Design a protein around this ligand. Structure first.
Ligand SMILES: CCCCC[C@H](CC(=O)NO)C(=O)N[C@H](C(=O)N1CCC[C@H]1CO)C(C)C
Ligand SMILES: [K+]
Ligand SMILES: [Zn+2]
Lengths: 167, 61
């Protein structure tokens, strides 16, 4: 099913997600809905926080043919470089805005897979950006938090106006 | 629709950039993404529609 995506400045996006303790079929059903929502948006990743489910679950697909859907449960990342790279990021919870964010582009990922089993992965390039963006969401962080005060406020006021029309 | 087209084009170019070995393919991808960003920042739907169509072709190459 398609889930509703929360949008900045909704305060529920600031919730810190709780770890998943059991990877049951109810978790896999949520993952399946997260993928459907992501593919339809479209986006290349999604965190459960964004669909108002405050559990530590991230989905992703960086394949051109939708052949490599990836699941990250209770994800953590650790930089493997002090080098910083820029990437112009957008966010389905900050729709319509694309801004440069500085992040390490080499990290180690630790998480549980779709069966609940642990794994580790070294990530570079877009996968390194995406996992940091998605983990940020699980910690209640949005990419606009890296921007200047005035740029963030212009984005907030623009979205608040769009939302007033939505209601 | 328009928004989905813009997003899908950005995704396509970003993945081509990531998976490309030739830095000239990466440059071309980055250039089309910048035009999309600039057109979408101005809500210039006409240029966005034109750039999306060019992006689809350069990816068919
Ligand atoms: C790069 C880190 C982005 C993580 C995924 C986001 C979706 C999201 O909000 N995840 O939390 C996305 O797909 N964003 C898209 C996006 O910004 N992209 C997709 C390819 C790379 C980048 C554009 O430079 C837009 C177009 C919906
Ligand atoms: K922009
Ligand atoms: Zn996001």
């Amino acid at each position: 099913a398609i889930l509703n995506i929360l949008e900045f400045p909704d305060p529920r996006l600031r919730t810190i997600a709780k770890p998943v303790e059991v990877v049951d079929d109810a978790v896999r059903q949520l993952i399946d809905d997260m993928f459907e929502t992501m593919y339809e948006a479209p986006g290349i990743g999604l965190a459960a926080t964004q669909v108002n489910v405050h559990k530590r679950i991230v989905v992703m697909d960086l394949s051109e043919d939708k052949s490599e859907p990836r699941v990250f449960i209770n994800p953590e990342f650790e930089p493997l470089t002090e080098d910083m790279d820029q990437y112009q990021e957008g966010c389905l919870s900050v729709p319509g805005f694309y801004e440069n964010v500085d992040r390490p582009q080499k990290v180690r990922i630790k998480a549980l897979d779709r069966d609940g089993n642990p794994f580790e992965e070294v990530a570079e390039g877009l996968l390194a950006v995406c996992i940091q963006h998605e983990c940020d969401h699980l910690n209640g962080k949005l990419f606009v938090d890296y921007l200047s005060t005035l740029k963030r406020d212009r984005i907030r006021k623009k979205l608040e106006k769009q939302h007033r029309q939505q209601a | 629709d328009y928004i989905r087209e813009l997003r899908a084009a950005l995704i396509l170019l970003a993945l081509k950039k990531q998976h490309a070995e030739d830095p000239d393919a990466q440059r071309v991808a980055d250039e089309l993404m910048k035009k999309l960003f600039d057109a979408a920042h101005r809500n210039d739907k006409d240029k966005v529609k034109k750039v999306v169509e060019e992006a689809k072709k350069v990816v068919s190459t």
